[PDB]
Symmetry: C3
């Protein structure tokens, strides 16, 4: 009930970029710029639908025993699994990396949100902190590859595509370090900050994580 | 009950192309012709399994309140999400387009059938006309890109791959304009033409949409 | 109950390769070797999570009528659909095949485990031997393409990438011929060898199928 404003405002903050970024897109100047744009207009568009999902009844599938109390949203992972892989596909093409590190990067995140989604889904004889750990170890892996493999290739004769990528790394690193700590303290972990606050918190991270990320890759 | 003949005949009309098109395929003459064939044999093959799904009990997940009355098929979107993206992958390679417009084209349809599937699934505090609209806006987008972006590239020194693509555009445009209007009048919208007729209608569009489409890309 | 040891040991036998193979990976010597490694570390990693899924309560969705007796695991197909396509992506890049035969190969397996998963899921007016057949016909197809299309390209001026691929074909062919016969005799077919034995059987095939497969592609 008290998450509605964060739900609808979340859709409103995404129902802006999909509108703004769609106008600049489709402008055939460079074939490479086309793929870069495409994605950073599809990303806030998939989450927009998803937030409108949480707004209009959707998102439910329980955590440790549902029906009795604990309310949860599955619609969230339904988009993080369909947002994180493409957002890295925009930062892997910038770094002009080989299909090798890109592949692991999809299978890495796939498992990261797969394992998290499962973690949230009921608690069938398993501890939900088990999966939270597997998904965290899955995330650190990316941070390793991000500030190690990408950096050892970040330059490309162009100071921009190398320093305007550093600002991306700052955005992303602080951004993603966030999600995990937001889990085991209320939403789907402990039970300190219930559902209400968790819903705003998660959305702040999201609007900044996509439109803000895209609001970098436009400059 | 009265959809069985349209179900089984639908499987019969697909259980023909998968058989015909499989014989001509695997003929290594051109590496490019190989990828073109592959898909237009996998498409009527995925729907064939799906139709046999609707025939043999599958397809259920409710619309506005199930269990009481309104019978629906989820197996349908389970294939449209797995047919439309590849069928455009055959018309995007013909146009020899960049990975840019191809990508948006997958994420565009993904959301088109994702949003439609959801629209059909129950009606949890949300209007099923909301998603029908989001999926329609998702479809017009493709029609824009199809008869704008593809045309402004349709030629390629080969009159065939440019005019035998125009006949594809006619097939596709009239074809897809169909689905949407078929929704809000009975099947999962209003309630004029119930389930019976809707089942034939949908299949006519399908046999023509795939085998007929493939029966173009063979000539 | 009696499958626990096979479940946990299965996770233990995969919770070894993901550890071993991760140490050798990320070693940038060749851009081509990078993609080859990536996958054969992600494969036993996805199944590892899945086995830990079967271990910790997950895997349930019934076969012919559930809730009354027949216990099943859906977590299995949840990984075979996410293991078989990538494992062939490692043997299709070795053979340096065109995007044509690779594509059919993904859509072929997709339907193979899709059709099998469905086969296992309840038995809604349909015979579970119907899908078992569709999934078998889907598998023979690959064996045709594997020991026909790949062989008629296996050489590449390098005796290794052509003979150390033959040993892969032996591993794979005997390996995959296995799964199908393991189905209609107990697990989800007849009812001779119940759940207990089926759980070991399936795991023997798995540890050998991935780590052992990977333990080839490392040499
Ligand atoms: C737009 C949304 C994006 C980019 C979401 C990204 C999400 C993450 C970095 C999530 C990470 C998680 C964990 C490390 C463990 C617990 C589960 C998650 C999903 C919160
Ligand atoms: C073989 C099946 C194919 C190519 C199916 C294509 C489907 C569409 C063009 C569907 C469009 C829809 C809408 C615009 C809104 C309502 C939901 C759909 C799925 C009927
Ligand atoms: C690591 C797991 C792998 C590589 C699994 C491969 C699985 C198969 C070859 C499965 C085949 C099946 C059939 C032919 C019919 C019945 C259903 C299956 C899934 C057992």
């Amino acid at each position: 009930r008290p998450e509605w404003i964060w739900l609808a405002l979340g859709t409103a903050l995404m129902g802006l970029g999909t509108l703004y970024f769609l106008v600049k897109g489709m402008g055939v100047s460079d074939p490479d710029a086309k793929k870069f744009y495409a994605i950073t207009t599809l990303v806030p568009a998939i989450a927009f639908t998803m937030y409108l999902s949480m707004l209009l009844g959707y998102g439910l599938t329980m955590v440790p025993f549902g029906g009795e109390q604990n309310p949860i949203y599955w619609a969230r992972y339904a988009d993080w699994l369909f947002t994180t892989p493409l957002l890295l596909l925009d930062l892997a093409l910038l770094v002009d990396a080989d299909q090798g590190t890109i592949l692991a990067l999809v299978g890495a995140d796939g498992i990261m949100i797969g394992t998290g989604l499962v973690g949230a889904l009921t608690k069938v004889y398993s501890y939900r902190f088990v999966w939270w750990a597997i998904s965290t170890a899955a995330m650190l892996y990316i941070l390793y590859v991000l500030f190690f493999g990408f950096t050892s290739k970040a330059e490309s004769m162009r100071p921009e595509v190398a320093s305007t990528f550093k600002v991306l790394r700052n955005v992303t690193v602080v951004l993603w370090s966030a999600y995990p700590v937001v889990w085991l303290i209320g939403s789907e972990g402990a039970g300190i900050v219930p559902l209400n606050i968790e819903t705003l918190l998660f959305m702040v991270l999201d609007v900044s994580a996509k439109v803000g990320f895209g609001l970098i890759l436009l400059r």
